[PDB]
């Protein structure tokens, strides 16, 4: 089992890098794939790729060796890079939900409203906020707790645990996860409501002749929507729930579980290529690249 854990890290890195490299290539190389939605997918794929290339490897070795081998500065820089890429990834999932909301419910409005320049500004903002939650507080020691046993891990270069004050653990978790999640629930709930209410109008149209039923296309939409919200929440809610818990009653949740739940979150970066790049044009480009 201890050897199974190390093998399982290797495939995680392979899936993340393979999948995301393949997506970014597909979008860059094909003229047809360069849509506005795929512009937000490109932001997402960059973040996830940096997770696979830098964050997960260094994270893997902290589990293998039981200790940080690259010193205090690279513990701080790596912690910042982790938070940056996770913040950018999850916030970008939220921006995508809004993009698809506008394009589905109000498609003619969406074309004039969401320009290429406006999409770039949104993307820049997602990354700027990711930076100011990650690099600004962590490098400047604002994330630091005053506790003595916490202050032992900051003094020790071999120790690279994630220990934060109350403020930072709450604020970072909200900005990286909870604001994005609530926006995604609100946004995608209205796509369900829009489709539900549209079935209502089609039934009123009939003059009591027919009652609409859920066909193929409605059940596929529900499955897709279930995968989007289900996989994202399965992967990141457990870690981010615990991350707020640990501030208040610290010994309540073990350390092995806290780390394992964080790794569950890194797995989402391997799932995101699969969920958000199933379009016919993506499937064709992927065949052309291989």
């Amino acid at each position, epitope marked *: 089992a201890a050897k199974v854990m190390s093998l399982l890290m290797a495939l995680v890195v392979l899936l993340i890098v393979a999948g995301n490299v393949l997506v970014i290539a597909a979008i860059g190389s094909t003229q047809r794939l360069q849509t506005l939605t795929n512009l937000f997918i490109t932001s997402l794929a960059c973040a996830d790729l940096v997770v696979g290339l830098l964050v997960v490897p260094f994270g893997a070795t902290l589990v293998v060796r039981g200790t940080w081998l690259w010193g205090s500065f690279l513990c701080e820089l790596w912690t910042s890079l982790d938070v940056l890429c996770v913040t950018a990834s999850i916030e970008t999932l939220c921006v995508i939900a809004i993009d698809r909301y506008l394009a589905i419910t109000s498609p003619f409005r969406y074309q004039s409203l969401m320009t290429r320049a406006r999409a770039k500004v949104i993307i820049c903002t997602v990354w700027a906020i990711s930076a100011l939650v990650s690099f600004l507080p962590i490098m400047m020691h604002w994330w630091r707790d005053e506790d003595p046993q916490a202050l032992k891990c900051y003094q020790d270069p071999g120790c690279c645990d994630f220990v934060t004050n109350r403020a930072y653990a709450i604020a970072s978790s909200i900005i990286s996860f909870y604001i994005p999640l609530l926006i995604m629930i609100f946004v995608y709930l209205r796509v369900y409501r829009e489709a539900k209410e549209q079935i209502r109008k*089609i039934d009123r149209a009939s003059k009591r002749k027919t009652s609409r039923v859920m066909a193929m296309k409605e059940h596929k939409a529900l499955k897709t929507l279930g995968i989007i919200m289900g996989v994202f929440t399965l992967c990141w809610l457990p870690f981010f729930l615990v991350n707020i818990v640990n501030v208040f009653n610290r010994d309540l949740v073990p350390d092995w579980l806290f780390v394992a739940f964080n790794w569950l979150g890194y797995a989402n970066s391997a799932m995101n290529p699969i969920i958000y790049c199933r379009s016919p044009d993506f499937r064709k480009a992927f065949k052309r690249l291989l």
Partner: nanobody, 119 residues
């Protein structure tokens, strides 16, 4: 999903025509039906489109003259073309954009139906 197109033909300048595309098949509740056209030796351009929530979109060449509407019950879209000119002569295609995938749109195109207007 099959798009059956009718109402096209020959008509005199100043005349009216009513195109009608019925879409038989599985389509998501939320969708955008429209009419495109392709003049001889030109690119396919949008004429008119209507969202499942009543939103419309017209091209300036046909604004004020052409009116697009959709059948309340079934997936059928009508384009009432009035004050026709010889410029409007084209192969008019019916289009359905299905949003059932959520993350992307799927296109359906009809075979095309000839409209020809003379002066």
């Amino acid at each position: 999903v099959q798009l059956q197109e009718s109402g096209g033909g020959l008509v005199q300048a100043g005349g009216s025509l009513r195109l009608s595309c019925a879409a038989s098949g599985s389509i998501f509740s939320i969708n955008t039906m429209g009419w495109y056209r392709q003049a001889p030796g030109k690119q396919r351009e949008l004429v008119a489109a209507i969202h499942s929530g009543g939103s419309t979109n017209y091209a300036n060449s046909v604004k004020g003259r052409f009116t697009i509407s959709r059948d309340n019950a079934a997936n059928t879209v009508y384009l009432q073309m009035n004050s026709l000119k010889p410029e409007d002569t084209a192969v008019y295609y019916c289009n359905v954009k299905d949003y059932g995938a959520v993350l992307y749109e799927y296109d359906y195109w009809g075979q095309g139906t000839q409209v020809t207007v003379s002066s």
